[PDB]
Amino acid sequence: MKQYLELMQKVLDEGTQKNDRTGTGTLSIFGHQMRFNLQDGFPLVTTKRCHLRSIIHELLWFLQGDTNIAYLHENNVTIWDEWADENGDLGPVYGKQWRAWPTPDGRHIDQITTVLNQLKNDPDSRRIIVSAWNVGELDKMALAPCHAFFQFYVADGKLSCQLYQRSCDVFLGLPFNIASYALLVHMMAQQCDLEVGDFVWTGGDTHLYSNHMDQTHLQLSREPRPLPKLIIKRKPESIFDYRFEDFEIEGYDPHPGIKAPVAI
Amino acid sequence: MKQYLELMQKVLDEGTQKNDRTGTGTLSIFGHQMRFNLQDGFPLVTTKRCHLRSIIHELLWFLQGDTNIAYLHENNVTIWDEWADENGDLGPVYGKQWRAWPTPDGRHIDQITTVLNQLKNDPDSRRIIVSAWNVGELDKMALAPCHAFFQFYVADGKLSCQLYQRSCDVFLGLPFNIASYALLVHMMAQQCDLEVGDFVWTGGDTHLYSNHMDQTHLQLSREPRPLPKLIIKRKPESIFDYRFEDFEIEGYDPHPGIKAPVAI
Ligand SMILES: O=c1ccn([C@H]2C[C@H](O)[C@@H](CO)O2)c(=O)[nH]1
Ligand SMILES: O=c1ccn([C@H]2C[C@H](O)[C@@H](CO)O2)c(=O)[nH]1
């Protein structure tokens, strides 16, 4: 995608040399914002082949308030294995904060139902937020939230959403981060009888790993392809009743996939 | 300031008509980012006269973990009167979350000391965040946090900071929001022996009230003046030991102040 290749280029020309946790060197910039008008197509990178099936499964897993790996494993989605303990537990990461934020007095707040309530009954609210940055629970999480905080906005029959991402690996993680969130904007929109608007991605430490340089140059050689179309085959009775087979990507013709290794 | 006048213009040309809580109409945009290099001068708007003395006093008040109005009143700073109850209490707003975030198990987390610890002993961290969006305490706050979440970043001996602001009144509140945060970047920098870098302002619902149109047009007529210089007369022994008289703004020559009324 144009916005994405322009950001890859920006990190190459402007990033400062910064190191990652006792390991790999990175080219790094701080503070960046991109906008995707979801009416123009689904923001799935076409300059390299991306597999959406793990993305869908992880999102549906988050929506259930699930913090254990078992569901992902029944579907052979293995992207959280690296962090999970011996019982498949990741600690109170994303879905637990989304669905059951714990208060000092013993309550558990369902931020996802609050947001749908606000979108239906108070759409002009400037407070339609869900946050995963729970300070009191960060020491028990396998990893602190990267996509930490997001806000919905309604204007002119259209749902927009801005994500704050504290930390971003531009090559491996970001195409996945964008498709994940654009999919949720479409599910929320369908549930509230709204049209989709914009996904605004805002990042903090936005970077490229030094051993991914040959791959980023290979990708920047490539011209972007027409963006694909997401079709949802069914309107579920609530946001928590979606199934993997409800989603289809139509018109997706990427360039070949590129492998990105990581140090250990 | 150039960036600020370009944003005022953007809300005029691009904002959609959106209404505020059962009241005034606004011109509204969603998703905006601006960068201020603090080496180029202190980002205090010169196209209208702004009074910094309440800004300093409110920031020092936040740093003490103070949620009651008394301190502001001893100095005749009256900007929080509107929200305070009969005893001067505002509920667990900003300073209480900054200094004593309450956990489900009875602890109180000092996010400001954590951030200084990280800046001194782990400066490359992608997790140097303080958040005021405490979901479990939002129903007891006088108003939910507008400047909700911010992240520090260190690269090349320089401290940068990005603020996420959920909601912003461009005319009355934003010049105040920027100077408040730019001042804290300078205090944190002084305490960590770092130089100042950039203040990145990111906003959610960024707007202009309909009864402020004559004033925004008057301000856009004006050419920006050279930005002022902030001098700190003393290095305190910690971030919690600053005093009002430690700060001086040098070289500030604004255009006359403009009044902005509000509906009730
Ligand atoms: O949603 C995510 C999660 C992690 N990362 C990156 C951040 C950093 O590069 C590394 C942290 O484990 O992986 C992302 O890009 N996106
Ligand atoms: O730091 C702040 C606090 C409030 N507001 C605005 C948001 C909205 O316009 C109104 C909410 O009371 O005041 C700001 O611009 N900045």
Q: Where are the domains of chain B?
A: 1-264
Contact A31 B202 (CB under 8 A): yes
B148, burial (CB in 10 Å: exposed 0-12, middle 13-18, buried 19+): buried
Distance CA A85, CA B82 (A): 50
Show the tokens assigned to A122: 């108070």
Distance CA A35, CA B202 (A): 13
Q: Is A12 helix (H, G, I), strand (E, B) or coil?
A: helix
Pair A188, A157: CB distance under 8 Å: no
Q: Which ligand 1 atom sits closest to the C-alpha of A209?
A: 9
User: What does DSSP say about strands A158-169 and A195-209: parallel, antiparallel, or unpaired?
Assistant: parallel
User: What does DSSP say about strands A229-232 and B129-131: parallel, antiparallel, or unpaired?
Assistant: unpaired
Pair A186, A152: CB distance under 8 Å: no
CB atoms closer than 10 angstroms to residue A164: 25
| A10 interaction partners in chain B (CB closer than 8 Å) | none
Closest chain A residue to B106 measured between Cα atoms? A104
* CATH placement of domain B1-264: 3.30.572.10
Question: Any idea how long chain A is?
Answer: 264
Select from A4, A27, A150, A167 the residue to mutate for testing ligand 1; criterion: most ligand atoms less than 8 Å from CB: A167
Show the tokens assigned to A87: 């019982």
Residue indicated by tokens 């509140």: B173
Looking at residue B65, the DSSP 8-state letter turns out to be: T
User: What does DSSP say about strands B108-109 and B101-102: parallel, antiparallel, or unpaired?
Assistant: antiparallel
Pair A42, A228: CB distance under 8 Å: yes
Residues framing ligand 2 (Cβ under 6 A): B 146-147, 167-169, 173-174, 177
Q: Cα(A198) to centroid of ligand 1, in Å?
A: 23
Which amino acid, one-letter code, is at A90?
L
Q: Which of B105, B144, B160 sits opposite A30 (nearest CB)?
A: B160
> Which is it for the CA torsion B73, B76, B78, B79, positive or negative?
negative
Residue B227, φ and ψ in degrees, nearest 5: -65, 145
Element housing A149 (H / E): strand A147-155
Pair A218, A235: CB distance under 8 Å: no
Looking at residue B68, the DSSP 8-state letter turns out to be: B
DSSP letters for B2-63: HHHHHHHHHHHHH-EEEE-TTS-EEEEEEEEEEEEEGGG-----SSS----HHHHHHHHHHH
- Provide the H-helix boundaries in A69-197: 70-74, 94-100, 111-121, 174-191
Q: Which of B21, B31, B153 sits opposite A205 (nearest CB)?
A: B153
Structure solved via: X-ray
Residue B19, φ and ψ in degrees, nearest 5: -95, 150
Helix axes A213-221, A2-14, angle to 10 degrees: 140
Pair B263, B23: CB distance under 8 Å: yes
**Resolution of the solved structure (Å):** 2.1
Distance CA A153, CA A197 (A): 9
Show the tokens assigned to B52: 């910094």
Show the tokens assigned to A263: 């140090």
A3, burial (CB in 10 Å: exposed 0-12, middle 13-18, buried 19+): middle
A61-97 burial, b at 16+ Cβ within 10 Å, e below that, comes to: bbbebbbbbeebeebebeebeeebeeeebbbbbbbbb
Distance CA B189, CA B196 (A): 6
User: Cα dist. A249→A52, A132, A183, A229, B259 in Å?
Assistant: 9, 28, 11, 6, 53
The H helix count followed by the E strand count for chain A is 7, 10
Distance CA A176, CA A55 (A): 7
Distance CA B146, CA B140 (A): 15
The candidate with the shortest Cα–Cα distance to B145, out of B76, B204, B190, is B204
Distance CA B170, CA B183 (A): 19
Question: Any idea how long chain B is?
Answer: 264
Distance CA B259, CA B243 (A): 29
The candidate with the shortest Cα–Cα distance to B188, out of B153, B225, B147, is B153
- Is B173 an 8 Å CB contact of chain A? no
The candidate with the shortest Cα–Cα distance to A184, out of A66, A86, A90, A58, is A58
Query: Within 13 Å of residue A181, how many CA atoms lie on the same side as its CB?
Result: 30
Distance CA A160, CA A199 (A): 6
Q: Is B190 helix (H, G, I), strand (E, B) or coil?
A: helix
Distance CA A234, CA A243 (A): 9
Greatest CA separation for chain B? 55
User: Is A126 marked as a binding-site residue?
Assistant: yes
> Which is it for the CA torsion B9, B15, B21, B24, positive or negative?
positive
User: What does DSSP say about strands B158-169 and B195-209: parallel, antiparallel, or unpaired?
Assistant: parallel
Select from B166, B167, B171, B205 the residue to mutate for testing ligand 2; criterion: most ligand atoms less than 8 Å from CB: B167
User: What does DSSP say about strands B195-209 and B229-232: parallel, antiparallel, or unpaired?
Assistant: unpaired
Strand-pair partners of B159: B154, B196
The candidate with the shortest Cα–Cα distance to A206, out of A16, A1, A3, is A16
Show the tokens assigned to B100: 């004593």
User: Cα dist. A52→A44, A189, A239, A252, B239 in Å?
Assistant: 9, 20, 19, 11, 47
N-to-C CA span, chain A:
30
Which amino acid, one-letter code, is at A226?
P
Show the tokens assigned to A232: 């949802």
Looking at residue B230, the DSSP 8-state letter turns out to be: E
N-to-C CA span, chain B:
30
